Amino acid sequence: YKSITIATEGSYAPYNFKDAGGKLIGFDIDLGNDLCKRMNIECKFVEQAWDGIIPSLTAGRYDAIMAAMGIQPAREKVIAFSRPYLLTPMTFLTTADSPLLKTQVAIENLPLDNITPEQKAELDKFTKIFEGVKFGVQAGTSHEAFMKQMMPSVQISTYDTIDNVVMDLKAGRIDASLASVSFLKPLTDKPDNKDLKMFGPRMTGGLFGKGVGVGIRKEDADLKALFDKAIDAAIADGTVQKLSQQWFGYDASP
Ligand SMILES: C[C@@H](N[C@@H](CCCN)C(=O)O)C(=O)O
């Protein structure tokens, strides 16, 4: 390799989004440039809408995906991933005045790889509470996958982008959503969003898989080995922790 094209969404702050000048910025952009510098490869970032991100990678329109992509088992059937460059649980989002906030959380940290009757009871409690509520999710995400598989009886509306989900939640058109803590903590930390609150269990594993990784074509074993080595070095020297603090306001590094 001499040069690679990396796709990003361009609308998932603070991982990847556009600055005032329309330039792609975020944790994925800074890390992507840092990993490529280590790999001694020229780096170029392209904007790609969420729906075609995986098929455009397999079709060879670009070489890699760095777009807050969860290493989910369903995505692993189609593409390969680098080792994780970030770890984050998943949680729910509502308004600060919502009665959903008074719901008792019996399991703070909910692993989903194996589901015990106690963990199922907790998911069933939340499903029954969410049955009388309007949920909104971004289409084609692990957020939609979770609602479809784990809470099918809950009424969901799907959106093109996460920004539209947040806007409708703020406008009162939906009552709740879900995303990773890495997305929701900087969102709710903004003085702009004091009327928004994270709530419910912090979930890991199962359909979510473990961590956020670089999406690569399965046949590109050499490119994966290069990214894995670069990621190991960026973690070891404190670069991932530094970039995580900068963009997320906390340490989500593996
Ligand atoms: C970490 C990030 N993962 C989402 C990203 C959605 C970006 N459009 C996913 O893997 O589907 C999140 O849930 O916050």
Q: How far is the CA of 253 from the centre of ligand 1 (A)?
A: 16
| E strand residue ranges, the chain | 3-8, 17-18, 24-25, 42-47, 64-65, 80-81, 90-95, 109-111, 135-138, 156-159, 177-180, 196-204, 215-216
201 and 94 belong to one structural domain? yes
Specify the CATH number for the domain of residue 166: 3.40.190.10
Number of domains the chain is built from: 2
99 and 170 belong to one structural domain? yes
Atom 11 of ligand 1 has which residue's CA nearest to it?
141
190 and 245 belong to one structural domain? no
Experimental method: X-ray
Residues with Cβ within 6 A of ligand 1? 9, 12, 50, 68-70, 88, 138, 141-143, 179-180, 182-183, 212
Calpha distance 175→31 (Å, rounded): 34
157 and 201 belong to one structural domain? yes
- Tell me the structure's resolution in angstroms, rounded to a single decimal: 2.1
227 and 190 belong to one structural domain? no
- Give me the domain span that covers residue 242: 1-88+208-254
Comparing CA positions, the residue from 17, 4, 7, 2 lying closest to residue 56 is 7
CA distances 232 to 31, 42, 85, 103, 229, Å, are 12, 19, 9, 40, 5
Comparing CA positions, the residue from 85, 84, 45, 40 lying closest to residue 242 is 85
Calpha distance 24→41 (Å, rounded): 19
175 and 133 belong to one structural domain? yes
φ, ψ of residue 221 in degrees (nearest 5): -60, -40
Chain-centre distance for alpha carbon 156: 19
Looking from the CA of residue 70, the nearest atom of ligand 1 is: 10
Name the DSSP letter for residue 217: -
Tell me which of 173, 190, 207 is where a domain ends: 207
114 and 221 belong to one structural domain? no
Report the SS3 class of residue 14: coil
